[PDB]
Design an enzyme around this catalytic site. Structure first.
Site, short mmCIF file in Angstrom:
data_model
loop_
_atom_site.label_atom_id
_atom_site.label_comp_id
_atom_site.label_asym_id
_atom_site.label_seq_id
_atom_site.Cartn_x
_atom_site.Cartn_y
_atom_site.Cartn_z
N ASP A 1 0.86 -1.17 0.00
CA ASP A 1 0.00 0.00 0.00
C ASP A 1 0.90 1.23 0.00
O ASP A 1 1.85 1.30 0.78
CB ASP A 1 -0.89 -0.03 1.24
CG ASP A 1 -1.92 1.07 1.25
OD1 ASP A 1 -2.50 1.35 0.18
OD2 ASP A 1 -2.17 1.64 2.33
N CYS B 1 -7.73 -1.40 -5.79
CA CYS B 1 -6.74 -1.68 -4.76
C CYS B 1 -7.58 -1.43 -3.50
O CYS B 1 -8.67 -1.98 -3.39
CB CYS B 1 -5.52 -0.74 -4.85
SG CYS B 1 -5.78 1.02 -5.24
N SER B 2 -7.10 -0.64 -2.56
CA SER B 2 -7.94 -0.40 -1.39
C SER B 2 -8.83 0.82 -1.66
O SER B 2 -10.06 0.75 -1.55
CB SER B 2 -7.07 -0.15 -0.16
OG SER B 2 -7.90 0.02 0.97
N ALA B 3 -8.21 1.93 -2.02
CA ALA B 3 -8.93 3.17 -2.31
C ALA B 3 -9.30 3.27 -3.80
O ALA B 3 -10.21 4.02 -4.18
CB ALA B 3 -8.06 4.38 -1.90
N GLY B 4 -8.59 2.52 -4.64
CA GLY B 4 -8.87 2.55 -6.07
C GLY B 4 -8.27 3.75 -6.79
O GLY B 4 -8.80 4.21 -7.81
N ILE B 5 -7.16 4.27 -6.27
CA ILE B 5 -6.53 5.42 -6.91
C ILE B 5 -5.00 5.37 -6.98
O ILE B 5 -4.41 5.77 -7.99
CB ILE B 5 -6.96 6.75 -6.21
CG1 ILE B 5 -6.58 6.73 -4.73
CG2 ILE B 5 -8.47 6.94 -6.35
CD1 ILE B 5 -6.89 8.04 -4.02
N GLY B 6 -4.35 4.86 -5.94
CA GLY B 6 -2.90 4.79 -5.95
C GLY B 6 -2.35 3.70 -6.86
O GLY B 6 -1.86 3.97 -7.97
N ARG B 7 -2.39 2.46 -6.38
CA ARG B 7 -1.90 1.33 -7.17
C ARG B 7 -2.74 1.18 -8.45
O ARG B 7 -2.20 0.93 -9.52
CB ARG B 7 -1.95 0.06 -6.30
CG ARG B 7 -0.89 0.08 -5.18
CD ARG B 7 -1.07 -1.03 -4.15
NE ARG B 7 -2.10 -0.71 -3.17
CZ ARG B 7 -2.46 -1.52 -2.17
NH1 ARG B 7 -1.88 -2.70 -2.01
NH2 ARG B 7 -3.42 -1.14 -1.33
N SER B 8 -4.05 1.36 -8.34
CA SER B 8 -4.94 1.27 -9.50
C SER B 8 -4.57 2.31 -10.56
O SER B 8 -4.55 2.00 -11.76
CB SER B 8 -6.39 1.47 -9.06
OG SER B 8 -6.83 0.40 -8.25
N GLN C 1 -0.65 7.95 -6.03
CA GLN C 1 -0.59 8.58 -4.73
C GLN C 1 0.73 9.07 -4.18
O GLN C 1 0.75 9.81 -3.21
CB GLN C 1 -1.26 7.66 -3.72
CG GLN C 1 -2.77 7.75 -3.76
CD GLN C 1 -3.29 9.06 -3.21
OE1 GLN C 1 -3.18 9.34 -2.01
NE2 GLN C 1 -3.87 9.89 -4.08
O1 LIG Z 1 -0.98 2.99 -3.36
C1 LIG Z 1 -2.11 3.10 -2.91
C2 LIG Z 1 -2.46 3.85 -1.65
N1 LIG Z 1 -3.93 3.74 -1.45
C3 LIG Z 1 -4.62 4.33 -0.34
C4 LIG Z 1 -4.89 3.63 0.83
S1 LIG Z 1 -5.67 4.52 2.03
C5 LIG Z 1 -5.70 5.94 1.06
C6 LIG Z 1 -6.32 7.16 1.68
C7 LIG Z 1 -7.43 7.03 2.56
C8 LIG Z 1 -8.02 8.17 3.17
C9 LIG Z 1 -7.52 9.47 2.90
C10 LIG Z 1 -6.42 9.63 2.03
C11 LIG Z 1 -5.82 8.49 1.42
C12 LIG Z 1 -5.11 5.69 -0.21
CL1 LIG Z 1 -5.01 6.85 -1.47
S2 LIG Z 1 -4.70 2.83 -2.69
O2 LIG Z 1 -5.20 1.58 -2.14
O3 LIG Z 1 -5.53 3.70 -3.51
N2 LIG Z 1 -3.25 2.53 -3.51
#
Ligand SMILES: O=C1CN(c2csc(-c3ccccc3)c2Cl)S(=O)(=O)N1
Length: 297
Positions: free
Chosen positions: A180, A214-221, A261
């Site tokens: 992550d 991914c988890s948030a759908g923006i970083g790794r995705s 991210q």
């Molecule tokens: O590399 C990454 C990091 N990812 C994140 C996990 S918590 C998160 C986040 C949650 C809440 C506020 C700001 C940022 C993000 Cl952004 S992701 O799963 O989109 N792929």
């Protein structure tokens, strides 16, 4: 340009500056539907929502909301649906979306548990004999088989619309070794994985948009999609020099916030693309090289 820019940005150690500039220039659109009180429990993260103009609408009576965005790359002529890791209460919505959008593949870049926390619900069956039925959306899901590799697993799933009794094969591409907020172990292992998704035919225009999360759908995705789109543009033109990575990322950001991210994920996007260019331009021998370097067996 991309390669001269890389060594240059890298010789001045200004990736953070380059990345932050992209953040400052990024589009800003409303996410009013996502912010409605009734949808609070459909969002995994308060500060990560889909813009209203590009959100995916569930063809549903009661509530059509799901935290997912359609990244429609006009020029590249490929679309992706980036969404958050589904929640315990949105797995039915997740599969409904896959069905209505006619997706053929689902790309997962995270693990259900990361850093001791649950970043994604167990939305697919881990055992053939224990299929899943999503009552709310009247869908049934069965694991048909799976090919486990060293750092990624590919699963064959059968999704059934209990209402019409039609069935479709969905391919699950699970990258299990991408931390992550981190980057893949090497451009090789990433490309090896990307090419596996490509070879499956899941990205074909004859299918609905591939679902990526991914988890948030923006970083790794975002990293996965940026690299793929850049290679595709380059491939369509057979001209690596015509690809402006930062421009592409900014265009993608018009469809979903925060794509990529960290400065390192951006830097890694360059590496992946630059290395991928070799295959695109005729050196297919490199594909076998990535496979070896990834240590998938
Ligand atoms: O590399 C990454 C990091 N990812 C994140 C996990 S918590 C998160 C986040 C949650 C809440 C506020 C700001 C940022 C993000 Cl952004 S992701 O799963 O989109 N792929």
């Amino acid at each position: 340009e991309m390669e001269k820019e890389f060594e240059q940005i890298d010789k001045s150690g200004s990736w953070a500056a380059i990345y932050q500039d992209i953040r400052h220039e990024a589009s800003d659109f409303p996410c009013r539907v996502a912010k409605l009180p009734k949808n609070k429990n459909r969002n995994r993260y308060r500060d990560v929502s889909p813009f209203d103009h590009s959100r995916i609408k569930l063809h549903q009576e009661d509530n059509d909301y799901i935290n997912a965005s359609l990244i429609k790359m006009e020029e590249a002529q490929r679309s992706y649906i980036l969404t958050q890791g589904p929640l315990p209460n949105t797995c039915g919505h997740f599969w409904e979306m896959v069905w209505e959008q006619k997706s053929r593949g689902v790309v997962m870049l995270n693990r259900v548990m990361e850093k001791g926390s649950l970043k994604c619900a167990q939305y697919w069956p881990q055992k053939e004999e224990k299929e899943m039925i999503f009552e709310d959306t009247n869908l049934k899901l069965t694991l048909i088989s799976e090919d486990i590799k060293s750092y990624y697993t590919v699963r064959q799933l059968e999704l059934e619309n209990l209402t019409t009794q039609e069935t479709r094969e969905i391919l699950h591409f699970h990258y299990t070794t991408w931390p992550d907020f981190g980057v893949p172990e090497s451009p090789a292992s990433f490309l090896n994985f990307l090419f596996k998704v490509r070879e499956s035919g899941s990205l074909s225009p004859e299918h609905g948009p591939v679902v990526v999360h991914c988890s948030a759908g923006i970083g790794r995705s975002g990293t996965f999609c940026l690299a793929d789109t850049c290679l595709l543009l380059m491939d369509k033109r057979k001209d690596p020099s015509s690809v402006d990575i930062k421009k592409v990322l900014l265009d993608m950001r018009k469809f979903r916030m925060g794509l990529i991210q960290t400065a390192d994920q951006l830097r890694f996007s360059y590496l992946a693309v630059i290395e991928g260019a070799k295959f695109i331009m005729g050196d297919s021998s490199v594909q076998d090289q990535w496979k070896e370097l990834s240590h998938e067996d």
